[PDB]
Amino acid sequence: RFQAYRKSIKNYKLSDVDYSNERDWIVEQLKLEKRDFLQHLTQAHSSVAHLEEKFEASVKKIVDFIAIESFEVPFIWNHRRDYALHTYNDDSNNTIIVKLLNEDDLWRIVQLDLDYHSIHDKKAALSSIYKQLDLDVVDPTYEEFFGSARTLSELQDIDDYLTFNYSSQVKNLTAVMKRKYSKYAIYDRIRQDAIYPVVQSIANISQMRENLAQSKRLHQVEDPIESPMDMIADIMSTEKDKTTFISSEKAYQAVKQFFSEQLSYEPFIRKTIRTAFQSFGVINI
Amino acid sequence: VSTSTVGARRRRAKQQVDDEENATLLRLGPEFALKQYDHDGNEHDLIALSLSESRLLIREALKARSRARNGGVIDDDELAKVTSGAVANGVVKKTLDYLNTFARFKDEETCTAVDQLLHNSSDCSVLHPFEIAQLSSLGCEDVDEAITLIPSLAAKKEVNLQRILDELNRLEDP
Amino acid sequence: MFFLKDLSLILTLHPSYFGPQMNQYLREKLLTDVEGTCTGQFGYIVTVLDGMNIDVGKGRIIPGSGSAEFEVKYRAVVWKPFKGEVVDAIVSNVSPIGFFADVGPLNVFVSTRLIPDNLVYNPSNSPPAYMSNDELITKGSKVRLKVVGTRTDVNEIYAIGSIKEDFLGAI
Amino acid sequence: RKAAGLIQSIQRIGSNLVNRAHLITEQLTSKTVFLNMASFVYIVFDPDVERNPQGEMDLLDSTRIHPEDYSLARKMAADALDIEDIDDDDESAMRNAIYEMVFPRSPPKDEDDLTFKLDELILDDYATELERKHQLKKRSTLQIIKEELQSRYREI
C-alpha cells in the first residue's frame, strides 16, 4: 500500500529541516480540519492544561512512525495506541482515557503526508527559481509570503508575482527557439518605454506594499505636480523618438492597464480576498 | 444520409494508394477532390474556407435567417439560439465559440485583402486551396514553422513564404 | 477544415401536409434534419447557405404509399478533420490516461503515450494538469495539436491528437 | 503480490509454518514487513503437541501479542505465578511457566484457571516500571496481553 502511494513520488526521503516542516504543516492542517473536535475536547476537559500540545506531540510521533519506520495504520492502532491516547487523572485521581485520535485520523495523516511530499517539490522549485533570479536586494514580500506559504495556491501566487515583477529577468534566465509569445512582452515594452517613470510617479511600489501590509497609512501617496494626461502628453511630445504609443489616450490606457496588472499580481490582495471568500463567502446558483 | 453530387463508383479490380485520407500528402479523397461539379454539372473547384471566411459566412447566414424569421425587422448566444434543435444549437454554439476564440480576422475588409493576397499572387496561383486555408488559419510566423506544420509547402519552394507571412502578420490585428 | 459543398437530400412528405405551405414546411424540415448533424463521410454540417430560398423541385408520388418524395439540393458549410493535420484546440478535461480537447464540435482525446514526457501529469495542482518546467496545460488552456487518427461512428466522429512533435503543445 | 509470493514460499518449504520466527529465519520476508504483519498472522497452538518442552511452536504465536513483546508476556506470566525463583533472563523457565499457566498438567482444584490470577497483577505499576527502565508507554499493550492470556483470539 505504501509503495502504491509512493509510486508517483520520485523523491521521498526529505531532509531533517524538510521533515520538521512537514510535521508542522501536518499539525496545522489537522488543527484546521479538526478544529471542532479540538474545541470540544478543550471545553469539556478544560481542567487539563495543554491537551492540544500533547495532541501535537502525538501527531508528530505518528508522522515519525509512518515516515521513518514505515508502520501501517492497523499495526500502530493495535500496538502504539498508547501514544494516541492521553491518560490523565482528575481531581479524584481516577484514570481517565482521552482518545486523541482514531484510525480515520491516521488515514488523514497518510493523506496529508502524501500531500506535503507533493508540495515539497513545488516549494523547492520556487526556491531554485528565486535563487536563479539572484536579486541584489532580497524582496521583503517574497520572504514574508514564502515563510507563511502553506498551500500550493500561495506558491502559485508567489510564482506569478516573481514572474510579473521580473519578467525581463525571468525571460533572460530562460534564455541563459520556439517563438512562444510572452504575455508580459507589452509590459516589458512599457518598462523600456519613457512612460514607465510616470507609472512610478503614480505611487511607489515599496510604499504601496508597506501600506498594504500594515493595513494602515504609513506613507501618503504623493500626487504628481501635473495631471496624468499632462505628463503623458508632455513626455510623448518630448520623446516622440522613443514613445511607441500613437496617441496620448493610448498611453493613458496602457498605463492604467499596467497599474491594474501591478495591483492584480500583488500577493497580499489575493491572499486577503481568498481569506475573505473562504470565511464569509456564500454560494449562488 | 445526404448524398454528394458525385455518384457511380462501381466495382473494379485495380487498387490505388491515393485513396486514403492524408493532409500531408494532400489526398483528400474523391468527395473532396480538386475538381467538383455544381447542380448544372459545370466545372467547379474545391472550396476551402479559413476560419475568417468561415466565421464571416456563418455569421452572415445566421443573421440573415434571424432577420427573415422576424419579418425583416449580433449577439452570438442569441444568434445560436435562433436555430432549431437542441443538439444543433449546441453544435453551432461550439463552432461559434471556436471561431470567436481563434478568429484571426474579424473584419470583412481584412479577410477580403487576405484572400486577394493569397489568390491573386503569382506564387499562390499554384498553391492548393487547402494550403491557403491552413496558412490563413494556423497563423504561422516562420518559414521553417510553416513547413513543419504544412509538409506540402516544403516541395513548393517557388513561394515568397516569408514576406507573405509578414504581410499576414501585418494584416493580423494586434 | 471548413469547406463549401453542394449536397442533396431525399425528403419524404406525408399526404396530410399537402397544402399551400408545403414548400416552406419542407424548408424547415430540411433545416431541422441537416443543421448540426454529423455524417462520417462528410463530417459536420454546421449551416446551410440561402436556407430560405432552396429549390425543392417537383415531388414524385411513391406508388402504393401515397407519400411524395422530394429531391432537395443545397449548399452547406461542412467541417471535417483530416489525418496528419495540425489545428488549434481548447482543453476540456484532464485525466491520468490523457486529456480531452475540443476542436469546434469535435472532441479529441490525446493519450499520455502521445504527450511529451516532460509534461508530467500533476494531480495535486488545482486544477490538475499535465505540466512541465516551462509548460502547464490544464482545462481551458489553448493547445496546438496534430490529428493522427479519426474514428468513424454511426453519427459521431472520434479523433486522436498528438503534441509530441515540434511547434505543438501549449500555445 | 506479496501474499502470493509468501504463500508460494510457504508451500515450497512445507505443509505448514512452525512458528513466527521462521518467517524471518527461513528468509520468508524482510524485517519491516514482518514487524508490521507479525501479530496479525498466527499458528493454532495444540496442547497435544505441547508435550515436548522443546516445541518450537510458541504458544504466544496464537495471540495478538507482538513477537517483540513475548519477553514482556513471559515476565507478566511469571509475575502472576508469584514464583520469585526464576529471574528475568531464564527464558526456558518463562516458557515452562507459560506452559503451566495456560495448559497446566494438573487441572486446578478450583474453577479459577492460572490465567485468571493475572487480574491480581497491577498493570499501572508494571507500565511505570517499563517507562522508567526503557521509556516505553505500553500500559495498553499490557492490557492487551492480559486479555489475550485470558482468552486466545476473542472475537472482536
What is the count of structural domains for chain B?
A: 2
C-B interface (Cβ pairs under 8 Å ≥ 3): yes
Q: Which helix (H) or strand (E) holds A250?
A: helix A248-264
Query: CATH number of the domain that B155 lies in?
Result: 1.20.1250.40
8 Å CB contact between C26 and C11: yes
3-state secondary structure of C5: strand
> What is the distance between the terminal CA atoms of chain A, rounded to a whole angstrom?
40
Q: Report the topology of domain C1-82.
A: Dna Ligase; domain 1 (3.30.1490)
Per-residue burial over B110-142, b if 16 or more Cβ lie within 10 Å, else e, is ebeebbebbeebeebeebbbbbbbbbbbbbbbe
3-state secondary structure chain B: CCEECCCCCCCCCCCCCCCCCECCCCECCHHHCCEEECCCCCEEECEEECHHHHHHHHHHHHHHHHHHHCCCCCCHHHHHHHCCCHHHHHHHHHHHHHHHHCCCCCCHHHHHHHHHHHHHCCHHHCCCHHHHHHHHHHCCCCHHHHHHHCCHHHHCCCCCHHHHHHHHHHHCCC
Helices (H), chain D: 2-13, 22-25, 31-37, 70-81, 91-102, 123-134, 139-150
Q: Is D139 on the interface with A (CB under 8 A)?
A: yes
Phi then psi for residue D56, to 5 deg, are -65, -25
Q: Is D130 on the interface with A (CB under 8 A)?
A: no
Q: Is D87 on the interface with A (CB under 8 A)?
A: no
8 Å CB contact between C168 and C86: yes
Residue in the block written with cell 515594452: A189
Same domain, yes or no: B42 and B55? no
Structural domain boundaries of chain C?
A: 1-82, 83-171
Cell for D142? 499490557
3-state secondary structure of D68: helix
The dihedral through the CA atoms of B57, B62, B67, B68 has a sign that is positive
How close is the nearest chain C Cα to the Cα of A178, in Å?
7
Q: Is C117 on the interface with A (CB under 8 A)?
A: no
How close is the nearest chain B Cα to the Cα of C23, in Å?
16
How close is the nearest chain A Cα to the Cα of C117, in Å?
14
Amino acid (1-letter code) at residue A114: L
Nearest-CA neighbor of A45 among A83, A81, A88? A88
Amino acid (1-letter code) at residue C6: D
Cβ <8 Å between C126 and A180: no
User: B34-37 contacts: CB < 8 A, separation 24 or more?
Assistant: B34/B128, B36/B5, B36/B6, B36/C6, B37/B5, B37/B6, B37/C6
Same domain, yes or no: B134 and B159? yes
The dihedral through the CA atoms of A182, A186, A187, A192 has a sign that is positive
Method of determination used here: cryo-EM
Q: How far apart are CA D55 and CA D35, in angstroms?
A: 23
Cβ <8 Å between B95 and C51: no
From chain A, the residues in CB contact with B141 under 8 A are 179
From chain A, the residues in CB contact with B104 under 8 A are none
**Torsion, Cα of A198, A200, A203, A204 (10° steps):** -160
A219 CB-near residues (< 8 Å, 6+ apart): A204, A207, A210, A211
Phi then psi for residue D114, to 5 deg, are -65, -25
Q: Is A94 on the interface with D (CB under 8 A)?
A: no
Same domain, yes or no: B166 and B103? yes
Same domain, yes or no: B109 and B65? yes
Phi then psi for residue A265, to 5 deg, are -80, 5
Q: Is A180 on the interface with C (CB under 8 A)?
A: yes
Helices (H), A7-139: 16-33, 35-44, 51-64, 73-79, 81-84, 103-133
Same domain, yes or no: B65 and B150? yes
Q: Considering CB atoms only, which of A125, A153, A174 is closest to C126?
A: A153
> What is the distance between the terminal CA atoms of chain B, rounded to a whole angstrom?
43
Size (chain A), residues: 285
Cell for C98? 490523457
Q: Which chains touch B (3 or more CB pairs under 8 A)?
A: A, C
Cell for D2? 506479496
Cβ <8 Å between C8 and B2: yes
Cβ <8 Å between C105 and B91: yes
How close is the nearest chain D Cα to the Cα of A163, in Å?
46
Q: Is D138 on the interface with A (CB under 8 A)?
A: yes
Catalogue the E-assigned strands of chain A: 88-89, 95-96
How close is the nearest chain A Cα to the Cα of C170, in Å?
9
Same domain, yes or no: B43 and B71? no
Distance set, CA D53 to CA A54, A256, D17, D98 (Å): 46, 92, 18, 11
User: A172-181 contacts: CB < 8 A, separation 24 or more?
Assistant: A173/A132, A173/A133, A174/C134, A178/C166, A178/C167, A179/B141, A179/B142, A179/B145, A180/C170, A180/C171
Same domain, yes or no: B121 and B76? yes
CA B49 to mean position of chain CA atoms: 2
Same domain, yes or no: B40 and B90? no
Same domain, yes or no: B83 and B147? yes
Q: How far apart are CA D67 and CA D31, in angstroms?
A: 12
| Range of the structural domain that residue B41 is part of | 1-48
Cell for A167? 519578467
Same domain, yes or no: B69 and B43? no
Q: How far apart are CA C56 and CA C23, in angstroms?
A: 7
Q: How far apart are CA C24 and CA A214, in angstroms?
A: 72
Phi then psi for residue B40, to 5 deg, are -90, 0
Q: How far apart are CA D76 and CA D122, in angstroms?
A: 10
From chain C, the residues in CB contact with A115 under 8 A are 124
Strands C142-152 and C129-131, how do they pair?
unpaired
D-A interface (Cβ pairs under 8 Å ≥ 3): yes
Same domain, yes or no: B19 and B53? no
Distance set, CA C168 to CA C110, C138, C149, C162 (Å): 13, 15, 17, 8
8 Å CB contact between C3 and B32: yes
Same domain, yes or no: B13 and B76? no
Q: Considering CB atoms only, which of C46, C80, C167 is closest to B92?
A: C46
Q: What angle do CA A201, A202, A208 make, to 5 degrees?
A: 105
Residue in the block written with cell 505465578: D81
Q: Resolution, rounded to a tenth of an Å?
A: 3.4
8 Å CB contact between A152 and A160: no
Q: Which helix (H) or strand (E) holds C68?
A: strand C68-79
Q: Which helix (H) or strand (E) holds C137?
A: strand C136-137
Q: Report the topology of domain C83-171.
A: OB fold (Dihydrolipoamide Acetyltransferase, E2P) (2.40.50)
Amino acid (1-letter code) at residue A51: L
How close is the nearest chain B Cα to the Cα of C157, in Å?
13
Distance set, CA D30 to CA D3, D13, D17, D26, D66 (Å): 13, 17, 16, 11, 16
Amino acid (1-letter code) at residue D98: I
8 Å CB contact between C22 and C52: no
Cβ <8 Å between A70 and D124: no
8 Å CB contact between A112 and A30: yes
